[PDB]
Amino acid sequence: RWLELGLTDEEKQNQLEQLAEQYDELKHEFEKKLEAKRRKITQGDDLAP
Amino acid sequence: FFEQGEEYMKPMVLADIAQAVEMHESTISRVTTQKYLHSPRGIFELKYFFSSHVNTEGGGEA
């Protein structure tokens, strides 16, 4: 959103900051979920001695 | 070692194990002879864990 250059200059900046924070949080959650899923898929199975 | 593998083993000596818990070298030397341990990694003798070290970067031992 052009980093909210000249939309409103009063609340558009805070709105863009909150939106970027939410996007970063969603990206972090997605990365963590993918990492956990990949770790659980190839975690390994116990076999006979 | 049990987590990561043979690639991640730290060196250990009889003298280090004796110093751990009120023990002597001679005594542990006899216990660990022909003794086996089963872990999900594999089946191994206790004598297998003990090995020599080489000088590494940063003063460490490999």
Curated annotation (Swiss-Prot), chain A:
Biotechnology: Co-administration of salinamide and rifampicin or salinamide and myxopyronin suppresses the emergence of resistance to both antibiotics.
Post-translational modification (record): Acetylated on several lysine residues in the presence of glucose.
Superkingdom field: Bacteria
Residue positions where N6-acetyllysine is found in the record: K27
Function: DNA-dependent RNA polymerase (RNAP) catalyzes the transcription of DNA into RNA using the four ribonucleoside triphosphates as substrates. Resistance to the antibiotics salinamide A, salinamide B, rifampicin, streptolydigin, CBR703, myxopyronin, and lipiarmycin can result from mutations in this protein.
Family per similarity comment: Belongs to the RNA polymerase beta chain family.
Assembly and interaction partners: The RNAP catalytic core consists of 2 alpha, 1 beta, 1 beta' and 1 omega subunit. When a sigma factor is associated with the core the holoenzyme is formed, which can initiate transcription. The rRNA transcription and antitermination complex (rrnTAC) consists of RNAP, NusA, NusB, NusE (rpsJ), NusG, SubB, ribosomal protein S4, DNA and precursor rRNA; S4 is more flexible than other subunits. In pull-down experiments interacts with CedA.
Protein name: DNA-directed RNA polymerase subunit beta
Gene encoding the protein: rpoB
Covered residues, full protein: 996 to 1044 of 1342
